[PDB]
Symmetry: D2
Subunit: 418 residues, 4 copies
């Protein structure tokens, strides 16, 4: 589980180098199952979720190794089942299914539980791989998928916006016969990236980043080297860190165009923001943030994954702000913990009413999920005295060396026994 001991108050200033998007790396690592020649994925973050995806890849008969690059030779994939002991730690492994069905005519993947931020069914994936020509059963907790021909292009209208299911259908439409159209498709940048990875293999895909994606099937996919775009959430995390610590950060190796909504909100909070080609800078000029109202929705709107972060921005901000969460049903678990640190918040349905306070007080708190965990470490940074954040394993899933990266911003953080 272990813990970060964070000593605050600490003004966060300097630079950080933004890492590859965890949420691009993962779907790309499973889409690599489609490749019949070796793939090299660059700018991959050293995250627990990447390690797990790698152990799952090797489990399926891929040869995998890594250092910023991950090498994947899926030429001899000979196992088609992602075991429970892996999927239980990474629900993103559902992404193994579509590729394996589309290349190998079969795939078996443990049906994910059971998540704290919401229930997160995969009905859209394992519909989707059905409207394509897959037959799917569930036996002993394994989603068993087969096509005893080869996949067939379909006009698919997604009845919910889903990042996960759009990736699945997209990836598993690159080896279909015919055209697949995906209506009401997710447009997050990770999906644009996965698509552009797939074209590097020689897939035919149009309109990634839009609400309609067109895939004409191909016979097989090759190899190639692909650089994963920067993590927009980790970027938003370090930008927020400075916003709430009255600081100034320059995020380098970044993609500002992935962040229209979040940058608008930090400006709304009174951050001085300049954007270059591959960097975002932010200076509070010594100033407490101003309270903003926020409403999560699918890209290009404000991301649910910045929600916990902006909640904390508000709780230390000037005035009252409203954080409405529309994507996940139970994503306010940070709030009772921030409350222990002296935050004044109220939860009405999927809205938290945040009455900004000048300073938080250090306290022992419990991280509940990835983005919560980071928000608590941020809260620790700017709180008076000692904060101990428990269950820090959550952070290790989606942030590479956050302790290092925050320490270079002046943070006082020690990873502690547990």
């Amino acid at each position: 589980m272990d813990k970060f001991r964070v000593q605050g108050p600490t003004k966060l200033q300097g630079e950080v180098t933004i890492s590859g998007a965890k949420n691009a790396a993962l779907p790309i690592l499973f889409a690599a199952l489609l490749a019949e020649e070796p793939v090299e994925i660059q700018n991959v973050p050293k995250l627990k979720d990447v390690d797990t995806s790698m152990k799952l890849l090797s489990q399926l008969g891929a040869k995998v190794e890594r250092x910023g690059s991950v090498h994947i030779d899926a030429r001899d994939v000979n196992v088609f089942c992602a075991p429970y002991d892996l999927v239980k730690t990474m629900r993103a492994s559902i992404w193994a299914l579509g590729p394996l069905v589309a290349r190998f005519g079969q795939g078996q993947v443990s049906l994910p539980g059971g998540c704290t931020i919401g229930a997160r069914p995969v009905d859209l994936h394992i519909s989707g791989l059905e409207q394509l020509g897959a037959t799917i059963k569930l036996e002993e907790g394994y989603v068993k998928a087969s096509v005893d021909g080869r996949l067939k292009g379909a006009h698919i209208v997604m009845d919910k916006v889903s990042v996960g299911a759009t990736v699945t259908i997209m990836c598993a439409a690159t080896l279909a016969e015919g055209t697949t159209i995906i209506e009401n498709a997710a447009r997050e940048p990770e999906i644009v990236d996965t698509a552009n990875f797939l074209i590097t293999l020689g897939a035919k895909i149009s309109g990634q980043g839009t609400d309609r994606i067109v895939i004409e099937g191909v016979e097989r996919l090759g190899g190639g080297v692909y650089r994963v775009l920067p993590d927009r959430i980790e970027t938003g995390t370090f930008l927020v860190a400075a916003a709430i610590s009255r600081g100034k950060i320059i995020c380098r190796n970044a993609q500002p165009d992935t962040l229209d909504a979040v940058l608008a909100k930090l400006r709304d909070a009174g951050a001085d923001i300049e954007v270059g080609e591959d960097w975002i800078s932010l200076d509070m000029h010594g100033k407490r943030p101003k309270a903003v109202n926020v409403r999560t929705a699918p890209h290009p709107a404000f991301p649910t994954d910045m929600q916990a972060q902006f909640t904390l921005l508000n709780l230390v901000a000037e005035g009252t702000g409203f954080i409405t969460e529309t994507v996940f049903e139970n994503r306010f678990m940070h709030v009772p913990e921030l409350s222990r640190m002296g935050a004044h918040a109220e939860i009405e349905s999927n809205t938290v009413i945040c009455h900004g306070v000048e300073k938080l007080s250090g306290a022992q708190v419990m991280a509940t999920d990835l983005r919560a965990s980071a928000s608590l470490v941020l809260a620790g940074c700017i709180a008076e005295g000692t904060t101990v954040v428990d269950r820090i394993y959550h952070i290790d899933r989606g942030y590479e060396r956050i302790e290092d990266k925050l320490r270079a911003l002046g943070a006082n953080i020690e990873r502690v026994k547990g």
Copy 2:
């Protein structure tokens, strides 16, 4: 982390002896902090949360022992802080606060952080105590209370129904100057039980079990012996166990009039129910349950602690039924775990739409909270094949020897360490 390996299918049938209410034993344990003479609480279940209560009682300087009975002598209580290490292992610990404030004019309890099943704030405990004349501050994650001398009785109209806040205010009001009226009090049998235990010590309480509790404050409370009432939720858990397994069960040492709503729904579901003075029989007559619609609400309505169990009943029942949870905002975490087992559910907000299936399949599942853990075990008993329920430590909080009791009904359960 211990797990249960449950083997199915198996018909659950025979006889079970209901243990004391976990949820009467706990509030009475903290209420014993008011006692100035030794106290014996009889029929206390051997449960983890009782152990935790005992640790915290001892850490406040009470002398505490147990076998059936837990003996407390709070004469020499001399520490008034409930520390983070304890509270965070059970939030019920907030119940030390009213006693300490009322008897000692001071009390500190770690502000509970969030919970798997909901945010669970304690605003009403705090405001209730404020209305009794307490000053309360939050310093360093600790809820600090103090009064100049004695608390003062007040007319308190509760903003919402809260079992825990009703207990807090009721216990504190017993040593206040004057009359306290709690309007819109919770009416749970455990509140009747706690009030009757307080009466045994010498408190003057009227209207327990009703929406209006009247307490006449006394200078001092003494000792006494009180037997805790039967666990209604344990009772319902085993009643469900027979129902979903087309079985027959007799619960001894029950208290039927605590279960009006659960027995009405079980009847709705097709159960042949009979009651005596201290026993309930259920017989399905070898037939699959019929689906039911349930809406959780405070006592005497259908209790939220039976919700996960009935979600299960509905998911193997004939036809379609819904469960709406109005008490906790995130108590559907058993649902995806049952989905792995072949259940067909759809969560739309605070409602679970269930389409009953004839058979479940054994799968590796994850217990997330107490009542979910038991439902997962119960699903294990009726599924075909092997179910492993991980994180069984949850069950240990609120069930006394559930493995031995199910085994006696015919269950095939082994406790497995790794």
Copy 3:
């Protein structure tokens, strides 16, 4: 249609005499169908709903006359249908069903369709009477209920708290063979009034006002005189009127023990409340009110029928308040109307975020339902300038002489035709 022209701002001053409860008068008027000897119901407010009840009664064959009192002779009832044409104007007329079935073994009432404030099903009425041994179908949009002989007493556990269902089952149960127990009964004061009316007629009822009502069926009910309790919602409306206008008021012929939650909220808002045996005074002391947090729930909690009024209070209060409606789902139609008058509101799910303003401005607004109309009139009193409230007939359903009572408090109101 008639409108009120209201001129403000007006400080609302003096005293009002509270009329009898619309919501005790109505169920009592229907219960009188059980009566085989003349009945006089005293203190009945002169209201459109009463006139409608009397019209329906005359149409079933009761002889009905009215001034203070309404006199009913149901000895000659010989028509057993409540037609659509009348139910459509007043859904309370579902209340004829239970009497007619219980006394005459048959009863037809048009199934109430939707309602401004929520869907309002009557599924709990039908189930209650079915549980008493009534066969019930729906043909041509009529609920048609029938028994052979008399009804039969039953142990009935109510799914949800229902005022209307509790009355329905309680009145029917008076002429049933055997004992009827209603668990999770509604505890509203109007239920107590209705039970006590039934008792005057020779019925055997205990536990009214508590969550379990027990009824011992008799062969036949008599007649009697019975005075209806004061209207707690009227009292609350006039207390709110004073509270929002910087006023002082005294409500004569009140019953303060019905208004615990309301008086407590007006206290949290900074009102000076005193009570007598039969009066309530409120005095703001030159004060504009202060924002509060309301959660509606069944009696004794804050009543949904005071919610529109308190929303009003919050929207002119100094501060930010939440009004949360748990009883009726769409009971927020006043909000956009008050918005026209300058209120800063914001509806989010089943809560309204009010951000109290200092002044309202007069505007042409539209009454949508009863309590909403009252709120808009009261808004008009404290708004600067002229407010015109259209569709004022809603108010006449449920308030006797509202305009006269307000004018005696110093309001400048004129009823207009077109």
Copy 4:
């Protein structure tokens, strides 16, 4: 106001010619206020809301007339107030504000106005115009908006998706100084249509149909001739008529590509659907539809304007299906009216659970809003016996000649006084 008498059951079959979209005609009519030379809008349906728009336009000092076409000469527009007496009967008149501010430097529009289906604030309309430079106050219930000179282009990020606020800002921006970007713009086909109308007048717009609309502002807009696209909601409504009545319809003058989601849900229901350039056919082949689950959301997802109709479809389909409504908080008022007809429906906050029945039964029912009115008329056609739908004024707002169109499909419908 008058009523429809429908005699069922009728199998609806034949052809229908779809009218121009009410919801393109309407923003197009108000966009015409920007035009400095006469405009002819072609394919405008003859509907109450067009008449009202026409009346409002005339009042603002446009010369307007109609037959197929509506002609508008807005050259001499010189009254800049949309008054309460017109706006109260049509929400969409809020659309007069933007054009008047953009072209004349000022506009006044009565703030709507409260609506049955939800509260419907226009805060995003206000805030988008303030972001383009307007100063907006609210005075006696009128939104009064002024700018000195032209508006100034702005990057506007919309916090929620709003069709109305998208059109407001897009129209106003056409005369703004410089460039305007709408982020999180609605994508509805009517927004595309309005943009293309605007372009016909010499506006420079791109991105319409996507989440980001770019408007480069121009000096003046001219005139031209523009044909409104087909009504996708009328189309959907007759497609559902064919579906629920186990019939066959061909819709002529359709635009199949505006209905991906609806067509996919109708296939899910067992419909055999074929599409051409300008036609859709649906043939059920004598079959009862199968129950489907529906989630409304902004286009291209399932439209909320089809939800009542598909609710109706589920309520007569085979099986159980759920309709979740994510756009408008109170759009289930058709349900309790369908309940009078023998529908088995259950509403649980924002979801209706439908358990389809073979046949509905004719009954007197009351329309509450436009799409509800239409669904009750459809329910009428297929119900057994006689249905009288009251308050059919709702239908006349958004359907042209639905009675003649339905009769041509074989329906037995008479318009009646009742």
